[PDB]
Structure formats: C-alpha cells, structure tokens
Design a protein around this ligand. Structure first.
Ligand SMILES: [Zn+2]
Ligand SMILES: [Zn+2]
Ligand SMILES: [Zn+2]
Ligand SMILES: [Zn+2]
Lengths: 87, 295, 150, 453, 66, 385
C-alpha cells in the first residue's frame, strides 16, 4: 500500500492532506478509497507478458534466447526469466 | 464565392389567420406574406446566385410555394442553369421581374390553399414537422445539383404565427437532430404564442428564436434579424440573448422533475407514480423499479 | 415479440399522453379549449368565411402594395433594438480577484474537496440502499458515522 | 511603372465615374433601370443591410445607432463599409433632426428603388415599350454562336485576322483606346500594349468601359441613356420584340445599337430593325466577377502536372490564338499540347506585365470543367513558379522625383521634412545624408516655400 | 539646393550595385547614375529607362549564359 | 508459354463489342459490379445504453500493407469516424478503449463518452509500434473486472479489433466461455483478412457476431453493422433509475456577477481541472461544472439530457420500409413526392402505407438521414387516435 502512495505523487498529494489537515486515517484511507482497483490497478504486475505463460512467449523463447556473449538482463523478464517460469 | 440558398417556412394557419381577421386587425395575412415575399426577394437582392425555398403549412398538406409545381413552373423550373428554352417568363428579369416571376406563383397557390376550407380531419393544425423535410430532401437534390466549387449555403427560416399542433413529439424532435447533422442554420420568428419545444429546436441549431413585439411591427426586426449568411450575424453584433429554457418532465402522471427513471428498455421515462409497466405488458424485472419506490 | 409489444403500448401512451411535459401540455390544451365553438363550428364558419374573405385580398396586392409604410412602427421597432443595443450597469470587471481566489483554493482545496467525493459518493451509496435494510453492515452503518466528523 | 488600373476597376466604375461627376449628373443615374446597378456593383454585405432598413425608414435614424450597430468585432470593416456607401453620395447626413446628426438616404433613389422592390407598373415595368415575345422566329443557341463569333472577330482582329473585321469605326476608337493603334500609312490595326492585356482578360466590362468612354470622345448624347441601356441590356435574353426597341427608341438608343451588333451583343436584321435581341452575355457584365455561368465553352479538365502545360481538347482557333500569344515553339498536333517554357511564356508577359491572377483566371479558364473533380490546390508550387517568374523580370519600379541634397542645415531639413510630410509630396527621405525623395509635381510648392522662408 | 530631375528606381541591392556596372558599361558616360542613396534607391537621367525596361534583362541573361 | 499466357488474361478483357460502341459494355459491367448489401434490418428486443470495449490487436500483422500503408491506418482512421458516428447515433453509451500490445492489455481510454478524449487518444495511437503478440486474456481480464463493477442493468458488449493472428495467451480462455457466459458480457470480434476458429468458436459461444475484413468499404460496413445497438441475449434488465435531469445555469439569474468564476475548489461541481463560470447543474450533488450529458463522480448518477440521448434511439427502432417498382404510374406530374424531380432509373419508390413516390436521393435521405417517411405525416397525424 505504501509503494502505491509513493510512486504516485498526485494521489500522494491527495494522501497528504488527510494527514496534513488530519482529515482521515490510513486505515480509513484504504477502507473506502480503493476497494475495486485492488483487481484493476493491481492487474499490471501480475500479468507481465501474460502470466501462467503457456502459449504466448513459447513462440519466442527459442529465437530470443541469445543475442551475444552477454546480451542478457534486459528488464525483469528480458530474455531469461520465463524460461525459468515453465520448467 | 458560394451560392447562398435560403429556406423559408411560413406559418399559414387559416384558423388563426381567420382569427387574425376576427380582431379586424391592422395587419392581415395579405399584409403578412407580401413582406415575406419581398423578404424572399431581399435574399435575392444580395447576389444573382441566391436561391429561395418557401412553403406554408396548409391543414391538409404543404405544397411547394416557391418555386412552383404548376404548368407555369412545371415546365419552366427557373432560368439560370439547365434552361427550358422558354421565351416569355425566360425573358424579363433583373431585380423586379424575378419577383413577379415568383409573386404570381405564391398567390395562385395560396389561392389553391385558401380554397380548401373544407377541413373535416379533426382540426389538423400546423404540420410543421413533415413540412420541414420537404425542403431538406429538395436541397439534398440541390446539393446534388452542383457542388463543384459550389458550397451550398442553405439557410432555413421558420415563421410561426399560431400555436403548434398535436404532432408526434419524436417526429418533432428528430429532424432537428437530423438538421443537427445537416449543418444548416434554422431561425424562428413567432407571432402569437411561445413554443418552448420549437425554441429548444433553436437551441439545437444555435439559430434564432423570436417573439414578435407586434404583428404589424414585423418589418424591421424581420429586416435586420431574419436576414442571412451566418456572416451577418456572427459579425453583426446584435443577438437576442435570451433563451431561458427549463425542460425535462415525465410521462406517467405529469411533473417537472430533476430525477427520471426508465420503465423498460424501450426508453420510457415516466413519473414516479407507476407500479406496473404502461410501456408494455412485459413485466418489470423485480430488482430495480421498486427501488424507485424504495428511497 | 419483445419490442413489438413495447411499440403497441408506449406509442399508445404517447398517443393518450402526447408530451405531458413543462410547456408541452399546459399551453397545448388551453388554447385548444380557446378554440371554443369549433364543434359548433361557428368560429370555423367565420374562419372559413375569413378563408373566403382574404382569399381575394392577398392576390390583388394593392392592399399588399402599401403594407410597408408605417414609420410609426419603425421607431418602436428601432427602440427595443437600441434598448437591447446597450445593456448597462452589470459589473463589467467581474473577475480580477479570481486569480488570488484561484491559487489559494486550487492549492489544497481542489484535492481536499476530492477527498470528500471519493468518500461522499459512497456516503450517498450506502444510504442509496439503507431503508431496504439489506446492505446494513456494521462496516457501513458506522462508516456513515466515521467520515461524517472526519 | 506600368498601368494596372485598366484591368479591373469594378466598384470605381460606379464610384470614380460617379464621384468624378456632379450629384445632379448622378441624379440622372437614378433612372429606375439604374436601380439594380447600384446594389450589385458594390459587394459589401454590411452596407448591403444598411440599405434594407430604408424602405421601411423614411425617418433619418440617428448616426450613433448604426455607428454602434456592430460592436468591437470588425469596427474597421464597419468603417470600411461606411464611407464608401457615403461616397456613393446616396446618403444625406442630416444636421440636427432631433439634436444630433442622423443620417438618411437620398429619397429620390428610395423612390426609384422601391418601385424596383414592390409594385409599380411604371415605364421600365410596363405601359410604354419594354419587351415582347410574339412568335419564335429565331433561337438563342444559334445566336449564342453570334455571341461567340463576334468575340472572335473582336479578339482575333485585335491580334490580326487573315479574315477581316466588319466595317466599324470602333477600331478608330480602339486605336484611340491605346489597346490598338495604327501608324499613318494604311492604318494597320495592331495592338499597342493594352489590348494584349485585354487579350489576357476575358470579360465584357472593358468593352463596357470604352463604351462608357464612347461618348467621351467629343460626343454629346445620353450618357444617362446608355448606362440605363447598359442595364437595359442586362435582361438575360429571350426577347425579340415587335420592334419594341423602336417603340422605346431614342436617338443614341438606335444609332449606338447599330454598334451593339458591331459589338455583337444585339442582333439586328434587315434595315437594322424590326426587333431587338439581348444576348446571354447580359449577365457577366452585371458582375464582372468570375462566375460559374461564365464558362463560355466547356472543353474539359486541364492540369499543369510537372509544369508542362499538360492538356488537350482541340478547341476553336481563338483559344489556339489565346495560346498563340502564350505557347508556340514545340506545338503539337490535334489536342493542343504546346509544351512549356519558363522563359518564353515568361517573355510573353513582357508586353503585358504581370498576368498574375490572369494566369490563375485562365488557369480556371483554359479547359473549363477542371474544378469538377480536381484538387483545390491546382498549382501546387506552380503558382509560385509563375510568381517568381513574374517576380523575376520586374527588376524596376519607374518613379520620377526631385531630390534635395547638400542641404545647408540639418534641423531645417527636418522642417522641410515636416513641410513635405504636411504636403505629402515626399516619397522617401535619407536623414543620414540629408536627402528627400520628393514628387516633382509637388516640387513647386516647396520651391515656392523655400524661396519665401 | 540642387534640383534633381532624375528617376528613382527601387530594387534589390543585388541589382542596385549592378547598375553601376551598367553605368561603366554605358555606351556614353554616366547618365544612369546621378546619385544613389544607400542600397535600394538610385537616380537616372530619364532617356532610355523605357529601353532599360528590356535592355537590362536582355543583358543579364546573356552574360550568365557564358 | 507464359509470355502469351500473361496476355491471354489481358486480350479478351480488352476486347468487346467491336465495330462501333467499343469500351462501352465494360463500363456497364462496372455499374453491374455495384449495388451491394443494403440493410436487412427489422429487429426488436434489445439494444440500449451499450458499454463498448475497444480491444486492439497490436501485432506484427500491422506491418503488412494489404489496404493501407499500415493496417492500423486502415483501422485507426475510421475508428474516429466510428467514434463520431456512434456518438451521433448512440450517446446513451460509453466505450472502453483498451489496447493489447506486447502480450498484455492497456486500457488506454477509460469507459467514457467524451469524444475528444477518445479521438486524441487515437491521434496518440498513430505512432504505435504494435510490438509483440496479441493477448486477449489480459484484455478480457480488464473487460471482466471493469464491467464486473458495472450494474446488471447495463448493456455488456465488447468490440475487438483483432489482426487474425495467433491468440497468444494462456490461462484457459476456453474456460473464459463459462466465465463470461455467466457474466452476461457479449464479445464481438471481426477478423482482419483471415479467421481464428477459436475466436470464431468464442463468438459463436458468445452471441457476439464475428466477421472477417474483406475490404476498406467492407470494413466500414461491419462498423456500420455494429453502430446499431444490437438485440443481445434475453434477460439482461428492464429499467435503469435515477436519471438525473439537470439544469443549465446562466450565472446571471438573480445576483449579477457575484462570482468571478464558478470553479474555486469549494463549489458543488467544478469537477475537471479548468476554470468555469457556471453553465450546468445536476440534481443530486447539485453539481455545477462544464456541461456534460453523461454522468458524474459525486452524485454518481446519470446526467441525462433528454433532447439528445433520450431522442436518439427514440426514433431509431420504429422504422418501416418502402417498395420499388419500375412501372409508370406518373404520380405528380412525373414528379417526386419529396424532392420533385425525375430521372426514371426504374426505381419508383413507393411507401408501404401512405404510398408516396420517391427517388434514390429521397430514399437514401430517408434511409440514412431522415429515417422515416414524412408522407406518413399528413397521413398518420390527421386521423391519429
Ligand atoms: Zn419501458
Ligand atoms: Zn449527488
Ligand atoms: Zn425522391
Ligand atoms: Zn409516408
């Protein structure tokens, strides 16, 4: 919940004045604000190149398995991780 | 640029124009249309390219008054463009014989309109709505007449003189929303009563609505205002600014309401006093329509 | 037969109640009642007589030659033109404190108010079902009480 | 430099003429036929509504009401629409009708205009001799050929015909016009410089101008009459007349008519009489503006793709003549596709000067239904080519003047600056070298002023 | 001080310097120059200016040709 | 062999009726090539207040040209037209622009009805690489979870722009049938120049209608086919309640210019980040902000504005048809009941009830712009009862 309020400064600016002007609590902040986007806004980090990866990446795992002696470690899945995510 | 077409819809309620004579007015129907005629000619006086469209609303019909149907223009159909090789009416012109080319054809046809006092169709009053599209098809053909470096600036005049009739409310509203597609200005001068519905039609257009100050005093505002181009009004800084318009009631009992609710999928928004569907015999799904009756 | 059945009854209701809205009904029948001896047709007789009367009056256009020269009715027609040509005394400079009265409320209070509307919409929502006494949860009936003072 | 007013002059025709003459002489220009002439050769939309009240305004409305008819939006356009309408001398500024100047029109025109608005069976409307279709003895598209070929025998004999023109004294006016001229032996009907410009023009209003200048060569007949008759031509066509132009005759009305079949726009039979004929020509004079109806013949589409003139349509010889002045030197056969030159057609404007719009006009007049399915931008870059070609050869701006150098002072030079700027006889100054470009016509007033001090 | 009945021509400085060369390549002495102001404004003895309407463009085209 | 055989194709098609009148009937067959499918409508039941979901395949299939320089160029340009003609016909609805790119799904524009926001999004969607493979499972995931929180009194339809490629997504999207069949959400795809059987089985298991793109004209047809709110499956809803009738406000009613601007972070309304002077007013929040005939965020009800949206479909159902005759009953003086002309290309268009004579340019003007015969007016309303 805390990475949500730090990576987004606009909602943090919203979240400031409930602590600054002491409007509500954090317990009340996550009780009536979010409640729907727990499935919607959290649908980014779970999917990530279609999780439960069966037939999406498997087409491209063999052609993108090698660029060079060190062509690896792109981002998160880059070119090594979903190999581990099947076996 | 362009050709600058005009459209004019005149109210001719012979019930009311008879009632215009019942007060023994200092402004009659004879005094009415002649102004409107030269008003139509005033359009023509800005440019040779200018063209007109004039129809009234008879109780049984709306015949094209301008330009003509009868054997004086059924074989003539105007001189400029696609000529009939017709000599006499094709001869005399230039700001004064064009009008008597069209003066005749209105007074002969309102004669054909004012010979049909034999109404038995249960006060079939002002039939504006179907009369509107009679222009709109014709100018669509006139759009297809020539467009090649020829922008059709059409402009619609509506003239009201009497009350509206009991016509179909949908078929009232739709053509304006179709005129909303059509991108043509519609302007309205009324004489006797106000039409909240037709001034909403003005609001759809962003045209102009006018209550007359006085029926014999309908020659100077008609000069200034109901006068063309959207150039003369987007530049002429004089707009009737008033357009007070509250609306939005419902249909079961009678109201004036800020909260509606539909009765079925059929777009039937009714008053709250409504147990069972009067839009159909299909019953309402029992989760929602008593929540209109719950809080 | 699903929207066939709607059409048979709603246009029937659009027939028996054709536009019972604001101006749409009340001016309508009132002037139809003003037509009066129209089944008696004595007004319609005079109408059809006046249909027959000014029948000839339009076409001659000698009466409708000079249905123009009334400069008596030009001045008044020039008048409400000139009257509406100059409205006056209505605070021409209406703003010019609005920049101070923007940046001070649109620094916190745009977002502060938004703190309410993220909540107050739900505050409308639990009461939008509460007399049915179904969505009656302790999580909600004191959430009525919670943010109320907050 | 070169004259450039002899081409268009389409509002000043009814202003610079009319304001160049007396109010009583333009009082004659309020013949009832001359009423339509006023409204249309002016084209403001803004003055075109300031008229519309006056049929209902007998009263002089106050000036401020229409001076403030239109607010902040386009006050200049209101002002530009105002004094020109006043410059027609059709208005009268009243003194203090109610306490302040409240303007009003000339009523005698309002008399004349309202008959052309509603009612009136008057002398131009009816009752004396106006018009008459009795039984069809002759047809218009046949006479449209006359309305084409007289233009040819006008316009070809300008360039020079292997055929011959008809026996006219008009050439001795067109040689007088400076369009044409002729040296003394044999009198060759050549072109001086200006018919060449009118060869590049295509409307009858120049003919009309020399026909307005027809009485100017020491002739004393109805200039009032002919310009009424100039309108009285502008009645479309479709009228033979039971010699109705002799029932409505006058002296110059019949004689100069002999010239209107020389000008071709009338068609006269045996004894130059028994009928009259207006040609379909009688509506493009009325504007002078381009007009979709002004298509003459409908050849086809053109283009100038790859600026290589790119077109065909074997047309009549006058268009061939219209490009015989404009494209020879790799002409080809049966389609009229003379190639392009960026020098020769450029040299073919040197005897005209710039034909800038007259290109663009004859762009939309080469093959006439080109704007039917083509681009709005018909020359993509090719206008600017024509422009830069026209902006190439124009290396000179001819201007005489008197220059004041080595002045004895420096601040009294600024006096003579302010003296000449008062006079408006300066064209340019150099203060850094104490120089002033002064007109030599307004030289004498400073020459008088300097000798006085 | 000095009555100057010359003719002002205005053009680009590209051609304004060129007329000096036409003055130096005049068949006679200096007439086309009387005094030129700075960059855009010159004065000519008005004799062949009408010829110089075409005597210049016939010359510059030929000189660049070879 | 083939140098002749390349020109055995040309030679006959060049050739026609010779002697006189050559290259003539070749033009006649081109007119005979025309006149494709007209309407074939006449439906009832459902279609009201759709909640559409634009789903875009962003893939390497776009790099093929096939109609345009890009298949998105075929796609994206006419979507704006499809947006505008939708908001023309159906303002009672709203559309979820969701973009699949690189095996995920980005809900690009939210489920809303603000056209400029949707169109500039498409204008933002111009320079899309469309890198990676399509994943519908991520698209249906957004489609579920969003429409899950929509009422069951909502029309639940999904419009998928798929580039006919391999449906590259795991997690038993075949089992998403019973997911969404139960969830009463309709899903309609049209294939770009090919077919996906699984997606074809998907739509036929849906009730959503599947098609294949033939041509750019044909691309427009099915858009136009899906402009109309379709009769989806039975037992969706009946009603939808607390349709807020608003007020326009002039901000000059009693107190003239007592407020320099009607958006100062405290006023009831003032929803969007911009200054305003008071134009509008909702019943339940009493929300005054920039005018919008849709809905709000604090009252949370539907900002219905009846002459616009309670009028649009309000005559889009009750249509009838005409007939065509080549005969000559010369009604009028060889005229039209509408535009009053004649060409006689043997399509004398007669109404079914009032039986009035029209042309193509009067039939089209009804059947595309007027949507009813006004000859029924003067004929319906005079004996109406
Ligand atoms: Zn219903
Ligand atoms: Zn509310
Ligand atoms: Zn038709
Ligand atoms: Zn009908």
């Amino acid at each position: 919940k805390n990475r949500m309020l730090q990576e987004d400064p606009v909602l943090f600016q919203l979240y400031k004045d409930l602590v600054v002007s002491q409007v509500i609590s954090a317990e009340e902040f996550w009780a009536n604000r979010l409640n729907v986007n727990a499935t919607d806004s959290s649908s980014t980090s779970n999917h990530k190149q279609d999780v439960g990866i069966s037939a999406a990446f498997l087409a491209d795992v063999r052609p993108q398995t090698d660029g060079c002696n060190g062509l690896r470690y792109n981002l998160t899945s880059d070119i090594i991780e979903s190999i581990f995510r099947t076996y | 640029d362009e050709l600058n077409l005009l459209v004019i819809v005149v109210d001719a309620n012979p019930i009311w124009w008879g009632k215009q004579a019942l007060k023994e007015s200092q402004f009659t129907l004879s005094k009415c249309i002649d102004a409107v005629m030269v008003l139509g000619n005033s359009h023509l006086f800005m440019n040779r390219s200018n063209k007109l469209a004039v129809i009234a609303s008879h109780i049984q019909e709306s015949r094209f008054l301008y330009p003509g149907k009868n054997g004086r223009l059924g074989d003539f159909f105007g001189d400029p463009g696609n000529p009939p090789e017709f000599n006499p009416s094709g001869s005399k012109d230039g700001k004064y014989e064009l009008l008597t080319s069209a003066n005749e054809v209105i007074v002969e046809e309102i004669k054909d309109l004012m010979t049909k006092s034999d109404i038995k169709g249960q006060h079939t009053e002002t039939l504006l709505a179907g009369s509107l599209a009679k222009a709109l098809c014709y100018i669509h053909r006139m759009n297809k007449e020539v467009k090649d470096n020829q922008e059709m600036k059409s402009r619609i005049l509506v003239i009201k003189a009497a009350e509206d009739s009991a016509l179909q409310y949908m078929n009232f509203m739709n053509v304006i929303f179709a005129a909303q597609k059509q991108n043509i200005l519609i302007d309205a001068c009324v004489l006797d009563s106000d039409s909240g519905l037709l001034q909403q039609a003005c609001d759809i257009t962003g045209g102009l609505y006018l209550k007359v100050p006085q029926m014999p005093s309908l020659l100077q505002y008609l000069l200034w205002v109901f006068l063309p181009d959207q150039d003369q009004r987007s530049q002429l800084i004089l707009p009737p600014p008033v357009h007070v318009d509250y609306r939005a009631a419902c249909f079961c009992h009678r109201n004036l309401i800020e909260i509606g609710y539909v009765c079925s999928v059929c777009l039937s928004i009714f008053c709250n006093f409504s147990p069972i569907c009067t839009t159909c015999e299909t019953a309402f799904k029992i989760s929602l329509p008593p929540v209109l009756k719950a809080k | 037969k699903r929207a066939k059945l709607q059409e048979s009854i709603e246009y029937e209701d659009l027939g028996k109640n054709n536009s019972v809205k604001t101006i749409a009904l009340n001016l309508k029948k009132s002037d139809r009642y003003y037509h009066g001896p129209t089944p008696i047709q004595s007004l319609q007789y005079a109408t059809s007589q006046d249909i027959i009367n000014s029948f000839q009056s339009i076409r001659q256009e000698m009466e409708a030659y000079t249905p123009k020269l009334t400069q008596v009715l030009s001045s008044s027609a020039a008048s409400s033109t000139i009257t509406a040509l100059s409205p006056g005394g209505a605070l021409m400079q209406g703003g010019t404190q609005q920049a101070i009265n923007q940046m001070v409320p649109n620094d916190i209070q745009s977002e502060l108010k938004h703190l309410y509307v993220a909540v107050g919409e739900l505050l409308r929502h639990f009461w939008s079902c509460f007399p049915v006494n179904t969505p009656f949860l302790e999580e909600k009936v004191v959430k009525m009480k919670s943010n109320l003072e907050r | 430099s070169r004259g450039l007013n002899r081409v268009h002059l389409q509002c000043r025709n009814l202003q610079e003429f009319l304001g160049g003459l007396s109010p009583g002489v333009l009082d004659r220009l309020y013949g009832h036929p001359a009423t339509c002439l006023a409204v249309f050769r002016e084209l403001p939309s803004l003055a075109k509504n300031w008229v519309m009240r006056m049929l209902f305004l007998e009263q002089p409305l106050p000036q401020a009401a229409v001076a403030l008819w239109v607010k902040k939006e386009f006050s200049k356009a209101q002002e530009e629409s105002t004094g020109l309408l006043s410059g027609l001398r059709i208005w009268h500024t009243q003194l203090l009708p109610g306490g302040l100047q409240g303007l009003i029109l000339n009523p005698i025109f309002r008399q004349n205009l309202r008959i052309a608005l509603l009612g009136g069976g008057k002398a131009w409307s009816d009752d004396t001799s106006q018009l008459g279709p009795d039984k069809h003895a002759r047809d218009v598209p046949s006479l449209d050929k006359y309305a084409e070929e007289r233009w040819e025998v006008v316009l070809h004999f300008m360039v020079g015909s292997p055929s011959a023109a008809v026996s006219q004294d008009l050439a001795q006016l067109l040689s007088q016009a400076g369009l044409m001229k002729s040296t003394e032996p044999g009198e060759p009907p050549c072109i001086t410089s200006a018919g060449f410009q009118f060869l590049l023009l295509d409307t009858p209003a120049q003919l009309w101008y020399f026909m307005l200048q027809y009485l100017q060569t020491a002739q004393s007949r109805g200039m009032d009459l002919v310009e009424i008759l100039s309108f009285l031509f502008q009645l479309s066509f479709s009228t033979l007349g039971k010699d109705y132009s002799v029932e409505g005759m006058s002296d110059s009305l019949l004689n100069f008519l002999q010239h209107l079949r020389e000008f071709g726009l009338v068609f006269q039979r045996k004894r130059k009489s028994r009928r009259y004929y207006p040609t379909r020509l009688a509506i493009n004079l009325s504007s002078g503006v381009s007009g979709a109806g002004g298509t003459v013949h409908q050849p086809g589409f053109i283009v100038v793709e790859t600026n290589y003139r790119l077109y065909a349509y074997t047309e009549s010889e006058l268009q061939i003549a219209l490009i015989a002045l404009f494209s020879e030197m790799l002409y080809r056969f049966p389609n009229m596709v003379v190639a392009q030159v960026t020098r020769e057609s450029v040299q073919q404007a040197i005897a005209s000067g710039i034909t800038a719009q007259q290109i663009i006009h004859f762009l939309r007049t080469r093959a006439h239904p080109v704007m039917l399915k083509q681009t709005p931008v018909l020359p993509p870059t090719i206008t600017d080519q024509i422009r830069l070609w026209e902006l190439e050869r124009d290396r000179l701006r001819f201007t005489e003047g008197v220059l004041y150098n080595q002045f004895l002072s420096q601040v009294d030079f600024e006096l003579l600056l302010a003296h000449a700027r008062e006079l408006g006889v300066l064209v340019f100054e150099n203060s850094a070298k104490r120089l002033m470009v002064v007109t030599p016509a307004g030289h004498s007033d400073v020459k008088r002023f300097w000798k006085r001090q | 001080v000095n009555v100057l009945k010359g003719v002002l021509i205005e053009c680009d400085p590209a051609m304004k310097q060129f007329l000096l060369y036409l003055d130096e390549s005049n068949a006679l002495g200096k007439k086309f120059i009387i005094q030129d102001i700075d960059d855009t404004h010159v004065f000519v003895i008005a004799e062949l200016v009408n010829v110089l309407q075409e005597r210049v463009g016939e010359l510059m085209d030929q000189n660049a040709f070879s | 062999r083939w140098e002749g055989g390349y020109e055995r194709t040309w030679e006959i098609l060049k050739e026609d009726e010779s002697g006189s009148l050559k290259a003539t009937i070749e033009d006649i067959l081109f007119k005979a090539k025309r006149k494709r499918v007209f309407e074939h409508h006449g439906q009832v039941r459902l279609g009201m207040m759709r909640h559409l979901y634009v789903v875009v395949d962003g893939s390497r299939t776009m790099e093929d040209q096939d109609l345009k320089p890009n298949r998105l160029t075929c796609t994206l340009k006419l979507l704006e037209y499809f947006v505008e003609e939708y908001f023309d016909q159906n303002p009672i609805s709203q559309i979820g622009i969701i973009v699949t790119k690189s095996k995920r799904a980005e809900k690009l524009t939210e489920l809303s009805g603000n056209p400029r926001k949707h169109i500039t999004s498409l204008k933002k969607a111009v320079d899309m690489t469309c890198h990676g493979e399509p994943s519908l499972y991520n698209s249906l995931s957004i489609a579920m979870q969003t429409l899950k929180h929509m009422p069951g009194h909502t029309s639940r339809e999904v419009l998928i722009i798929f580039s006919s490629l391999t449906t590259c997504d795991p997690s038993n999207i075949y089992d998403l049938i019973k997911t969404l069949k139960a969830a009463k959400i309709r899903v309609s795809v049209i294939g770009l120049s090919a077919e996906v059987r699984v997606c074809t089985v998907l739509a036929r298991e849906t009730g959503g209608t599947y098609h294949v793109i033939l041509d750019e004209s044909h691309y427009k047809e099915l858009l136009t086919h899906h402009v109309s709110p379709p009769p989806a499956s039975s037992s969706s809803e009946c009603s939808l309640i607390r349709m807020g009738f608003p007020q326009h406000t002039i901000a000059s009613l009693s107190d003239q210019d007592a407020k320099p601007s009607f958006s100062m972070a405290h006023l009831d309304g003032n929803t969007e980040p911009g200054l305003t002077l008071g134009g509008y007013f909702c019943p339940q929040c009493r929300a005054k902000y920039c005018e919008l005939p849709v809905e709000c965020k604090i009252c949370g009800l539907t900002l219905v504005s009846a002459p616009h949206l309670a009028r649009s479909y309000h005559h889009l159902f009750p249509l009838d048809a005409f007939q065509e005759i080549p005969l000559e009953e010369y009604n009028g003086e060889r005229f039209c009941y509408g535009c009053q002309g004649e060409l006689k290309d043997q399509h004398v268009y007669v109404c079914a009830v009032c039986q009035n004579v029209f042309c193509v340019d009067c039939d089209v003007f009804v059947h595309d712009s007027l949507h009813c015969c006004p000859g029924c007016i003067h004929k319906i309303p005079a004996p109406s009862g």
